[PDB]
Symmetry: C3
Subunit: 139 residues, 3 copies
Amino acid sequence: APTLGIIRLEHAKGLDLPAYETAGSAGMDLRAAVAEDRQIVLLPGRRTLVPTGLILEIPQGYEVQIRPRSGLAFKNGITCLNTPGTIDSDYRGEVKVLLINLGDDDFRIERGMRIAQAVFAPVIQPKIEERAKRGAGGF
Amino acid sequence: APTLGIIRLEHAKGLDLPAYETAGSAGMDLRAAVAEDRQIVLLPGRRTLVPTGLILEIPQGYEVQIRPRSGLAFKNGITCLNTPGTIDSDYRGEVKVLLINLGDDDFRIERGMRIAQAVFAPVIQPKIEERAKRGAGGF
Amino acid sequence: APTLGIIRLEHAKGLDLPAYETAGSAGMDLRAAVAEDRQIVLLPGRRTLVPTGLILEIPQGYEVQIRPRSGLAFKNGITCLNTPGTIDSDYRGEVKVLLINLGDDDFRIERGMRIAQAVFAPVIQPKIEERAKRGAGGF
């Protein structure tokens, strides 16, 4: 298999790195690397970037998709606004998750909270060819 | 090809199982297995789980992504809040679709309504390797 | 590699076609092919279809996913409501992007603005087999 490198920033010291729960899992949970003893408030309708404290080194030919956690979405109405968030093999910034509160309650973000799931996949670049002149894709 | 198993729960008796429309289709439409003669009201801003009455047996090495239907999104402002919803090869619960109404009208959910599309894909687990020290992925 | 065909409609004359920035990129940016000298207003909570002026000829065995741009989502609260938007190999309509404003400001859509990213991927159709009787997928 391919290898996903992960560089831990200081605020991710002490957290478990992402890992697959079982051989059957599709994604890895990502955790909030916010300050200990700090509760971040996300009010209804509002969005924020939540740090993971991780830099991903995704190898050439692959991507990471940042997808929502299903339980947060149901219980709280929280999702990832840019879902599926695309992280490419060039990206060497810190991975941050863009949460939006689409529910009615104030939501509290805490250190260690599972905030998204990451799915690693091959990516391909087709040749792009201009040509001259039902299917899914229309509205 | 791989085979996707589907176990039908009682409330899905009488509905067509998911199927690809053509050899070209990417997804399969999923239908609401709500009670006959019941109109479920989803008001603006609100979310709910819609039952499909299906248990998926996804084989090892594959996942299912639950994606929005484009026409509902356009016409009604309805989408899947946890999109793309990840269903892994361990999951043996009933598949439910988390709809949210991000439009202005009351939306009615009825038995048999197409509510999402399912895409079946291989999934890979890279080795996860901690390492020490523009690209898509930042904001 | 596979080849993605692109037929340019009249309103896309003069725009750069989608292209990968680097060998590492996962997606291609898509641009608004709206009229020059026209600012389209997308108010908070509202959604609209934004034309690209492109018809995609995706080859059999592949799909295109229309995903949000991360910067628009962060800066403006704009996303693609039907994300990831599925375009299959049968679809020969114009590709339009369904933007929704989930922020607080009026958003202006202008000709040439990058409005989404397209990811090209293989797609598979498993055999669908009904069978009789934790994992990601529940809520």
